[PDB]
Amino acid sequence: AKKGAGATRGVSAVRPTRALPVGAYLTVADNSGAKVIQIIGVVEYHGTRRRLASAGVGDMVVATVKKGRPDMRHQVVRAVIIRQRKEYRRLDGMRVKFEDNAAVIVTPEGVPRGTEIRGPVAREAAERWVRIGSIASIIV
Amino acid sequence: ARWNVCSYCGKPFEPGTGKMYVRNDGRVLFFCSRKCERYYFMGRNPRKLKWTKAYQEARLQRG
Amino acid sequence: GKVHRPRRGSLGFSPRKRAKSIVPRIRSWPKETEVRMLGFAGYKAGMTHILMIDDEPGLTNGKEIFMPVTIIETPPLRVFGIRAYRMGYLGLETATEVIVPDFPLDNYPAKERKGKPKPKMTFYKLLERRIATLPKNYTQEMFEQKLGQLEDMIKEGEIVDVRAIVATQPWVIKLKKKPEVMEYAIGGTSVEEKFNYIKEKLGKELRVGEVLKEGELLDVIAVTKGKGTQGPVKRWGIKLRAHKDSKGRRKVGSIGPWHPARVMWTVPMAGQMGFHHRTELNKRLIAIGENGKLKLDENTEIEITPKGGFPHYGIVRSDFMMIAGSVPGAIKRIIRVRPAIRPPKKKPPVQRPQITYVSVESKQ
RNA sequence: GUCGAGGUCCGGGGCCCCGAAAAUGGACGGGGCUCAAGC
RNA sequence: CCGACACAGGUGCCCCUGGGUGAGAAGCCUAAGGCGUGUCGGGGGAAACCCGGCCGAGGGAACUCGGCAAACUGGCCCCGUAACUUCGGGAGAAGGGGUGCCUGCGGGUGCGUAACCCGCAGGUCGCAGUGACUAGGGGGGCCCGACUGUUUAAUAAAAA
RNA sequence: GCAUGAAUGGCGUAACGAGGUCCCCGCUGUCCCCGGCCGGGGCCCGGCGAAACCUCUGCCUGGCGCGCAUGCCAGGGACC
RNA sequence: AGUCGUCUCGGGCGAGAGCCCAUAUCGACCCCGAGGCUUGCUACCUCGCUGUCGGCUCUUCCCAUCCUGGCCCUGCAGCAGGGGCCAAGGGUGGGGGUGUUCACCCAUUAAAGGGGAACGUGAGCUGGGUUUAGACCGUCGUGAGACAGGUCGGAUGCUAUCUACCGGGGGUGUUGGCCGCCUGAGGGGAAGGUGCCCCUAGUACGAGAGGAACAGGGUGCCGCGGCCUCUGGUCUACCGGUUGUCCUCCCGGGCAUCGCCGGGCAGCUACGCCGCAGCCGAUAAGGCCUGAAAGCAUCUAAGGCCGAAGCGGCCCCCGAAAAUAGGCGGCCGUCGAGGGCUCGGGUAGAAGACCCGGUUGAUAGGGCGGGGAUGUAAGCGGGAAGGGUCAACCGACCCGCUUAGUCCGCCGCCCCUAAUCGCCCGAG
Ligand SMILES: [Zn+2]
């Protein structure tokens, strides 16, 4: 088996609703330097005529930094969504919801560019990305 | 196969229904319906509603 | 081409007209070796949900998952006819058919209304509500002589197929009195064995437990819910016109080019929506109940009917099937099921799965 | 250098073949036709 | 009455208007007076679709020539208020806090415990107290014309 | 400065504007992606009851043709 | 419309460049062609009117193929590239400035192909540009004024006559009428298409760097057909709170968008949930066997075997008007089966049609019981910040009887009421 422990990606049994289209503003939950980002695209997604790309918990998006340190503003980066306001179903049939739309800035491979994550991290995102789960302090 | 207990009316609801709300500070609440969720978030007092389990505690509180 | 998008709607379900008959027809049958009737009929009861340990292949294997189920009540069918098919120039032709003579009805739920005794129903009295012209002075001797003639033709070898004619029994569940008549094919590779099976079951009652296997896949045939006339936006899912449009928004923009100088049949248009003949494939059979009860662990049995009864439906009283998912049709609709005609290579094991919870809470 | 009957080239004449891709479905007038019902 | 009409226009709204709320001849309710003749009726889950309204989860202009349409704000009291400037203004800039009902006091003019208005303390309910009705969205650059005003009655209101 | 310019005025300008234009906060069904509900039409039934328009007619594919034919040529379909 | 100078595309010779080697790749000079997708030329039809560019909506077609499927040569080690062939079933998206087509740019993507349909589509829409009438600037003109030079503003008419397509009905015919179940000529379909992940595997290959494939598992996205258990929206049924006013006050009500606000079952819905076979047959390019013409050789001349997301079948939908106008069991006729209207209701619905019930009865109503939505009614008793002669009485609000009261377009049991009387086709 390749990359037994160095793998940066995983799989999840739950698929959260894509409640965040292109143009949504996400709060940065880590200390990489950014504070607010805007979605300008969703990777690994094919749309259709006049359809905006949408992402949910555990999805990777391409975003432009709006607020943060001077060396981070106006920069195109990759982020992984860890919390969303739109409730989504889990295996037991129960719906889970969060308080805000929050994401963590990571490299395209999936290695976070920060060292601390604020607030809970969705179990789906933690399973999808091992590094995010490893660095997360609260997972629910 | 566990009956979650609503955080507003203090009653159990069947598996496959309801929802869980996660707060930023890390705590979790369970809501059996949109009615209970909306009342909790608006701030309606559950100790004054006879159909909630908190009313029994309030009755013991007063006497 | 500048911008490209897939066509709106499917042309493979045209014409989108009202179904020919409210009783669904089955055009094709599964090929099987086991000598059994290929399918069954029942009445839609409602929907609920269960929690079970998944067993089919996937990531969620061995884990507790949520699954919706449709409960359909299935009072036993009465096998009352046998039909034989020979080969014609262009296709199968009906060589002959024979039905049993009239017999007393021992499952009619008669109630002793004040005045007059119990009605004392008999067959050919519930059946005349559907056929309306039944044999007169029909006796067992002539019935047996007709059956013998049919067997003699089978021996001669001009009969290529045989089917069983059955009728529903709504009066048992007190849904209605008018029965519904259908014919079902039989599995196996010998017409003589199929005929012997049907002959043994002639005039008797047949239950789901004797034909269908728990945990196997099926195909469900029924007539969908009626929606009446609907516009193109809902019928074909076209795009709404721009909000500044002063000639409406829920209509197609252009219904064709200059040439050809005609409106093509492929342009979305308003018309009948719903009440269509449809077939859904690969619906798993979760469980078969008896007398409105489900046995879970051989120690606790629960009544499938939710508290307050099924909305728009009564109380389940007879055998019922729990199909995994949704089925076409309205409440009380007649729904037919056949063994899967097109199953996947990898399918769930043929057995009832492990059910951990059944929802019997009020659904209204 | 052993077989053992015509070989190896060149310029020409007739028919055919390749070179030969378009948009509503369809044009030898049509069916169709092969020692022709073609030349 | 005029417009071909028992015309949703114009002439004439030319003169006049109880009670409550309220700054108000505003909106809403109501007394007087008037009307059911802004004169074709009946049926219906009886559709599609069109005009006029009410709400819509998550995102918030990604739509479009262009935030077109809709939406936000909205009354009153208190604090607070920028660049610029012709010193007049900008200005209700911007922005922030309060608002219900009930029980008692203090104050102004007043002969008065008549009438109107202004504060204070306490108790209390709701998601919401200008609870309906009434009722501004705001800020920063550039071009043109100083401003109020006038214009193609019937496609141009503008820098003309 | 292809081809600005000082009374057919030059430059600037506070206040003003249903003038033209760019940006930001807030807002929102403009949009992702459309879904429900209400009143009036639409629909059916009983009455009063016109007008615009009208050579006669009125299915198609390839063609000939004043070069883009329901009506012609050869074919294909079509019960009212 | 004609033509193809021009435009797009293709071909012939092979100088020359490629370490040697014209043809892995490029192909000078010159010569022969296709298309009608750019522009031009002609003036053939239309000036008693065929309404412009762009955009939105929607349908369809061509291949000179951008991706997806299958292959050939290579200056093809692998991963990749360059060139060519078969193949049109499927896909070919989202944004910034600009009216823009186009071109440029951004982040994704398997790819983000070019074109025809009166430069498809205004009795479908929008009106940003073009192109009237108003006005400003530059230049030209003595002037009126002009500019394929800029700029602000500037109208989009319709009761469908025929045909066409979408659905819905009444008839005749099918060698007498009726009912019930079937067969399946013929038509339609994309009902499916396509990424990524684990393993094979740090393996084949390679000096290293780097780095595959067959097979086996999982899952996303787009498309299609269904359903309302769950979640969300709505829910002018319904319950509660409250503002102004009126019915004298209490209770209880009218109006003010449903007065406004919160919640809301049934129904309808999506943002929710479920379902969508990879196997046979023949083939295209291409890879081969046998084999002569041409004693050898040769995939082709005769003969044979494999071989594509393409073609046909399995699968789904319509289908006895399928003119060879079908089969079968039953019932009737030579009075009469079988129907229609009328009656009580929706598994249905614009009219028609369709389904269940009709005293062989639980179809609707009524009564009772179950399950629900709101959220504890009126009345009485007590407390209450206080005031009151600190007395009687007034008092927002609170507590108990009280999971109350109200209501139910959901279900079960009970014939208490209405499903009655009656009328008309109907083969011979
Ligand atoms: Zn609760």
UniProtKB/Swiss-Prot annotation, chain A:
PROSITE patterns reported in the protein's UniProt record: RIBOSOMAL_L14 (PS00049)
A Pfam family annotated for this UniProt entry: Ribosomal_L14
Swiss-Prot/TrEMBL keywords: Ribonucleoprotein, Ribosomal protein, RNA-binding, rRNA-binding
Gene Ontology cellular component terms for the protein in this record: cytosolic large ribosomal subunit
Metal-binding recorded as keyword: no
Functional note: Binds to 23S rRNA. Forms part of two intersubunit bridges in the 70S ribosome.
Family in the record: Belongs to the universal ribosomal protein uL14 family.
PANTHER family: 50S/60S RIBOSOMAL PROTEIN L14/L23 (PTHR11761), LARGE RIBOSOMAL SUBUNIT PROTEIN UL14 (PTHR11761:SF8)
Protein's name according to its UniProt entry: Large ribosomal subunit protein uL14
From Swiss-Prot, chain B:
Note describing how the cofactor binds: Binds 1 zinc ion per subunit.
Names of the cofactor(s): Zn(2+)
Positions with a binding annotation for Zn(2+): C6, C9, C32, C36
Entry keyword annotation includes RNA-binding: yes
Gene Ontology terms: cellular component: ribonucleoprotein complex; ribosome
GO molecular function: rRNA binding; structural constituent of ribosome; zinc ion binding
UniProt record, GO biological process: translation
Keyword Chaperone: no
Key words, A-Z: Metal-binding, Ribonucleoprotein, Ribosomal protein, RNA-binding, rRNA-binding, Zinc, Zinc-finger
Xref: PROSITE patterns: RIBOSOMAL_L24E (PS01073)
Zinc fingers typed C4-type, residue spans: 6-36
Alphabetized NCBIfam families for the sequence: PRK14891.1-1 (NF034186)
Sequence similarity: Belongs to the eukaryotic ribosomal protein eL24 family.
UniProt protein name: Large ribosomal subunit protein eL24
Originating organism: Pyrococcus furiosus (strain ATCC 43587 / DSM 3638 / JCM 8422 / Vc1)
Lineage, uppermost ranks: Archaea, Methanobacteriati, Methanobacteriota, Thermococci, Thermococcales
From Swiss-Prot, chain C:
Disordered, as annotated region: 342-364
Compositional bias of kind Polar residues: 353-364
One biological process term in Gene Ontology: translation
Gene3D superfamilies: 3.30.1430.10, Ribosomal protein L3, domain 3, Translation factors
InterPro entries: L3_arc_euk, Ribosomal_L3_dom_3_arc_sf, Ribosomal_uL3, Ribosomal_uL3_arc, Ribosomal_uL3_CS, Transl_B-barrel_sf
Family: Belongs to the universal ribosomal protein uL3 family.
rRNA-binding found in the keyword field: yes
Name of the protein in question: Large ribosomal subunit protein uL3
Subunit-level organization: Part of the 50S ribosomal subunit. Forms a cluster with proteins L14 and L24e.
Keywords: Ribonucleoprotein, Ribosomal protein, RNA-binding, rRNA-binding
Gene: rpl3
Disulfide links within the chain: none
CC annotations in GO: cytosolic large ribosomal subunit
Task performed by this protein: One of the primary rRNA binding proteins, it binds directly near the 3'-end of the 23S rRNA, where it nucleates assembly of the 50S subunit.
A single GO molecular function term of this UniProt record: structural constituent of ribosome
